[PDB]
Amino acid sequence: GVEIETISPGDGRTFPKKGQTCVVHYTGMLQNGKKFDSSRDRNKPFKFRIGKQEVIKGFEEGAAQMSLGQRAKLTCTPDVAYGATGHPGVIPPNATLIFDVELLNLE
Template sequence: MKTTATLLCLSALSSMATAATEFSINVYEGPTECDDENKVKVGDSLSMHYTGTIDESSETGEKGMQFDSSRDRGNTFDFKIGQGMVIKGWDEGLIGVCKGAKATLVIPPDMGYGAQGAGDAIPGGATLNFDVEVVEISDKDPEQPNLFEMLDEDGDGKLSKPEIEAFFVNQGGTMPDGLWEDEDKDKDGFVSWEEFTGPKGASPPAHDEL
């Protein structure tokens, strides 16, 4: 099973909207007020702990089932907020939360993984519950997985439709409708590094010219 740390970073590729329901956040431990330096804002690099479950209000999935936890692995999940690197519920819902705070996020499908879901663990239309902790806030860019390089199985510096489809099959699902059309902007039958909207690093990966 892919960890949610990976799935959160693939939201640009896997999220599909469903009917909107209500998002909520509840800080249950730690500071609720803090100075700007210790408050999450767009562009900050965060180190987070989380435990993700299917929320009791979810219309799909097994209510209360845990699908992943960074705490079980003993490593924080590090990412830059407000850049589309994670699901909308995290990208928008964590803004304003203080360093050291522990909070519960209830994330409806339109702010999570939508109608597509995320493999077998998170079915389409699921409302999610994340118990999170803001461990650290910094202005340093966290190291992100280079999804483009991971998907480029033949190393030719561009993504074919079968390569992207294979990723979703490995996740236990199928490629969302319209995704290929959105990514292949110049309609040449491939997705270039410039076109790709997922995590991809600062520069195109090196590859051998044929």
């Protein structure tokens, strides 16, 4: 599964609901600790829609368990994101990804 550690607490009430877009800033980290992705570098918030298989599941259930305004650490096992093939050129095969995700706004 996905383990979620809270970095900064949120409201604790407004959890994402079914078919609602989530606006997040994330920073992709490999398990050894090397950054491969970050929306803050692009300065554009990332929007994705819950339950429509737009992103990796590890990210989907991480955001679903997360709450509004809550900055949390998301760690994704190899089986929950890029299982064996991996992302060609970015993610090596059988890799564990750590995500620092903030739920800015539910819209």
